[PDB]
Amino acid sequence: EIPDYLCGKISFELMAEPCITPSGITYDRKDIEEHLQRVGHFDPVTRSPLTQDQLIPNLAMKEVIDAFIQEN
Amino acid sequence: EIPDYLCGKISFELMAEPCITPSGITYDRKDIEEHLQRVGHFDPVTRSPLTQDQLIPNLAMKEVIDAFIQEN
Amino acid sequence: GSMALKRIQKELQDLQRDPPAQCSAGPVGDDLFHWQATIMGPSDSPYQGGVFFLTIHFPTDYPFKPPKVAFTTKIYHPNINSNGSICLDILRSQWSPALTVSKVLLSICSLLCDPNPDDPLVPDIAHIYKSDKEKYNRLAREWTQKYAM
Amino acid sequence: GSMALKRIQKELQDLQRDPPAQCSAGPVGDDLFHWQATIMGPSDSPYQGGVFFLTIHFPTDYPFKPPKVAFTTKIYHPNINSNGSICLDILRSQWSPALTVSKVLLSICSLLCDPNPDDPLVPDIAHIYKSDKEKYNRLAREWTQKYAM
Ligand SMILES: [Cl-]
Ligand SMILES: [Cl-]
Ligand SMILES: [Cl-]
């Protein structure tokens, strides 16, 4: 039983490389980038304009995930 | 004992309004905002340039916290 | 990679543990890329009392491409044509990898309670809808009884 | 505003839980806005076998303003004047609210081990240090014995 907020809004799976967009949404780099490069340059959730360079590595979450991975 | 990644790099207290910087570092809006005003326009940790308008809401983290504020 | 399969398996999990109201869905064979979903005509609509069947085909590069969703049962509706094609922006230009079949399903339902004639697919029905809206329900409930009951 | 006090308290709770190597700190009576700290000679420095006392005064903007830290124990060092004033980056231009007293204490130990003669508070020692290294170690040793032993 994996919480949702630890899964990618695209992959639906746990996040390996979490990173947040300016709209304040976290994706898994590999998936969010596949989207920006094949679908369009917008936030899959807010649809605001978005581009690879605008992705900040959500370090906090990255830890939070490691934590969860320990006890599981 | 609260996990660390769920606390402010400044306040050290649990995070009420977690927002991220382009450095991946997450602070509590209140604290980081005063720092930018009283201390300077740079990331408290990385020290790279930073302005208030660059702070992004770390929503994922906002709910990871609530999630913790659950069992306790 | 075959992330599509992993994504589809997860979606199915969610969809089936909490299915859109009035709806139901599941893979056909062990083909998680070929689903069949069914919808109960909503409770005010002249579609009320009918059972509608649709086919959902997931493209190999899902969820980056939208799913192919079509009505296999006949229906008198302005946004759904004779060969089960549904006109719902979200299934076309407005598709987003973040959306799910469950969401699409919900749209189709609401789209059954509130047709959008300003963006037709079947002009006549769209017209009959705009003007003689009473005649619309007459033929809608008629088709439901003849093709969905 | 009183967040300062809350923060200072966590630091103290933290500090006394896992003291920086060679150091020790604790409140000086009441208001945690005032602390006492002792540092054992850097073993590795000519200050070895010496015990030094410092006073930490937290401003009201803490942690937005660096703590006021000073030696009370006399010490022969180019970066510390006879008033126990310490020329530390991390106490001046390089301060950050992310830094801690603990960190400051390690930084000070580091400084004992390796003085910074180019940014002195005592030109004269800075000189001896850079020119006659030995004379420097001798006096430091002598002063440690006389004032910190
Ligand atoms: Cl994702
Ligand atoms: Cl987020
Ligand atoms: Cl903070």
Author numbering:
A (entry chain D), B (entry chain C): 207 to 278
C (entry chain B), D (entry chain A): -1 to 147
Paper text:
CHIP has three domains: an N-terminal TPR (tetratricopeptide repeat) domain through which it binds Hsp70 or Hsp90, a middle helical domain that mediates CHIP dimerization, and a C-terminal U-box domain that binds specific E2 enzymes. By recruiting a cognate E2 enzyme, CHIP promotes ubiquitination of numerous labile client proteins that are chaperoned by Hsp70 or Hsp90. Two E2 enzymes, UbcH5 and Ubc13, have been identified as cognates for CHIP.
We crystallized a complex of the Zebrafish CHIP U-box and UbcH5a and solved its structure to 2.9 Å resolution by molecular replacement. The crystal asymmetric unit contains a back-to-back U-box dimer, with each U-box bound to an UbcH5a molecule. The U-box conformation and dimerization mode are essentially identical to those in previously described structures of free CHIP (rmsd < 0.4 Å), emphasizing that the U-box undergoes negligible conformational change upon binding to an E2 enzyme. The N-terminal α-helix (UbcH5a-α1) and two prominent loops, UbcH5a-L4 and UbcH5a-L7, comprise most of one side the protein and interact with the CHIP U-box, contacting a hydrophobic groove formed by the interface of CHIP-L1, CHIP-L2 and CHIP-α9. The interface buries ~700 Å2 of solvent-accessible surface area. The interactions are arranged around a central hydrophobic patch, in which the sidechain of UbcH5a-F62 protrudes into a concave surface formed by aliphatic portions of sidechains from both loops and helix α9 of the U-box. The phenyl ring of UbcH5a-F62 also stacks against the guanidinium group of CHIP-R263, which is held in position by a salt bridge with CHIP-E259. An additional interaction is formed by planar stacking of the aromatic sidechain of CHIP-F237 against the guanidinium group of UbcH5a-R5, which leaves the arginine sidechain free to participate in an extensive intra-UbcH5a polar network.
